[PDB]
């Protein structure tokens, strides 16, 4: 089997991407944030504290003839940005882009933090990291991909995120029309539960490539590119007037600037992030200070190849017995 679904930016800045997902019988379609940096599929629901729902579409398990309470199971997750959610668990039929999994754990939120409430466009998350990170207790549950894997034509999924445009998540096949040149594959460590890999270096603009190992994660659920302070300083030093602002919470730059590109290495291959992908717009409405899309990972504890990086590439998440990651230009 295979699946193919379009993923759409939630706003004009590509702050996140939503993908429609069918849950239950008859189908209830929710728009979920596919997140290769976590491993829980959770949704706003009829169980979510009413004051914490503001415009989201909810899953109502009582209206699904295939929903079953997973008795005694609870979940609770906290993300790197300080957001969180928790609740109980149903199993139900879940379909993405024509690919159907029966008996998928659907984690129903009883509580969500303010950042989730305030984002009316995101109805929940669909985790695509390794199932070892799944938070369901006392019986850990598998991700949608893990459940689908054996049925897929090939044990892979791909992320093809757009810049200010829709893109695609495919399951079970590689669309050879979706990228240019060849796909370069690179080793993955699953030791921390992530799609963790080592970039071979970087360049800023038309500058020379610096060969240096940068361990980090391919994380579709993180907006920005978070890299070591040395790398990030080298980038922003090429933008007149750019500075790190503790009050704003990162590097800002004059909105009048033209940003240089940023290149990262994948083995001997190179992925170029155009400068415009690094512009996250005014820090507040009407401001002439703009927020940067490359930020320091110092104090996160991990480097994160988020959407800023991934949307410059066609990315293969190869879930074979020994997982790997592939990157192609597009």
Structural domains in the chain plus CATH codes: 5-174 (2.40.70.10), 175-330 (2.40.70.10)
Q: Which of 220, 204, 224 is nearest to 212 (CA)?
A: 204
C-alpha distances in angstroms, 177 versus 76, 161, 164, 214, 314? 40, 15, 20, 30, 11
C-alpha distances in angstroms, 296 versus 58, 103, 105, 157, 228? 35, 40, 35, 29, 6
Resolution (A): 1.2
Q: Write b or e for each residue in 194-231: b if 16 or more Cβ atoms lie within 10 A of its Cβ, otherwise e.
A: bbbbbbbbbbbeeeeebeeebebbbbbbbbbbbbbeeb
What one-character DSSP code corresponds to residue 256? T
Q: Write b or e for each residue in 233-268: b if 16 or more Cβ atoms lie within 10 A of its Cβ, otherwise e.
A: ebbbebbeebebeeeeebbbbeeebebbbbbbbbee
Cβ atoms 271, 309 nearer than 8 A: yes
Q: Longest Cα pair distance anywhere in the chain, in angstroms? A: 60
Q: Kindly state the tokens that stand for 84.
A: 């969180």
Q: Percentage helix, strand, coil, to 5, in the chain?
A: 10, 45, 45
Rounded Cα–Cα distance for residues 327 and 270 (Å): 9
Rounded Cα–Cα distance for residues 169 and 154 (Å): 14
CB atoms within 10 A of CB 192: 13
Q: Kindly state the tokens that stand for 74.
A: 């609870």
Residues assigned a catalytic role: 35, 199
Q: Write b or e for each residue in 68-79: b if 16 or more Cβ atoms lie within 10 A of its Cβ, otherwise e.
A: eebeebebebeb
Rounded Cα–Cα distance for residues 257 and 289 (Å): 10
CA dihedral 13, 16, 19, 21 (to 10 degrees): -150
Cβ atoms 300, 242 nearer than 8 A: no
Cβ atoms 122, 18 nearer than 8 A: yes
Region class of 51: left (phi > 0), else alpha (psi between -120 and 50), else beta: alpha
Rounded Cα–Cα distance for residues 151 and 147 (Å): 8
Rounded Cα–Cα distance for residues 106 and 46 (Å): 13
């Amino acid at each position: 089997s295979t699946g193919s679904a379009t993923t759409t930016p939630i706003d004009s800045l590509d702050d996140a991407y939503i993908t429609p997902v069918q849950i239950g019988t008859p189908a209830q379609t929710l728009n979920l944030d596919f997140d290769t940096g976590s491993s829980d599929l959770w949704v706003f629901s009829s169980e979510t504290t009413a004051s914490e729902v503001d415009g989201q579409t909810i899953y109502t398990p009582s209206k699904s003839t295939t929903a079953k309470l997973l008795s005694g199971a609870t979940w609770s997750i906290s993300y790197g940005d300080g957001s969180s959610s928790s609740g109980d668990v149903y199993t139900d039929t879940v379909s993405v882009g024509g690919l159907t999994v029966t008996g998928q754990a659907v984690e129903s939120a009883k509580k969500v933090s303010s950042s989730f409430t305030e984002d009316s466009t995101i109805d929940g998350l669909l985790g695509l990291a390794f199932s070892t990170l799944n938070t369901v207790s006392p019986t850990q549950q598998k991700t949608f991909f893990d459940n689908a894997k054996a049925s897929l034509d090939s044990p892979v999924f791909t992320a093809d995120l757009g810049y200010h445009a829709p893109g695609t998540y495919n399951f079970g096949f590689i669309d050879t029309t979706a990228y240019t040149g060849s796909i370069t594959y690179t080793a993955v460590s699953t030791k921390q539960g992530f799609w963790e890999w080592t970039s071979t270096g970087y360049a800023v603009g038309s500058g020379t490539f610096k060969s240096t190992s940068i361990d980090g994660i391919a994380d579709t659920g993180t907006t920005l590119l978070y890299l070591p302070a040395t790398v990030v300083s080298a980038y922003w030093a090429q933008v007149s007037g750019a500075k790190s602002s503790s009050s704003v919470g990162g590097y800002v730059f004059p909105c009048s600037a033209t940003l240089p590109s940023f290149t990262f290495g994948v083995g001997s291959a190179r992925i170029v992030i155009p400068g415009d992908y690094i512009d996250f717009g005014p820090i507040s409405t009407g401001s002439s200070s703009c927020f940067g899309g490359i930020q320091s990972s110092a104090g996160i504890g991990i480097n994160i190849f988020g959407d800023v990086a991934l949307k410059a590439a066609f990315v293969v998440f190869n879930g074979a017995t020994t997982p790997t990651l592939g990157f192609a230009s597009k």
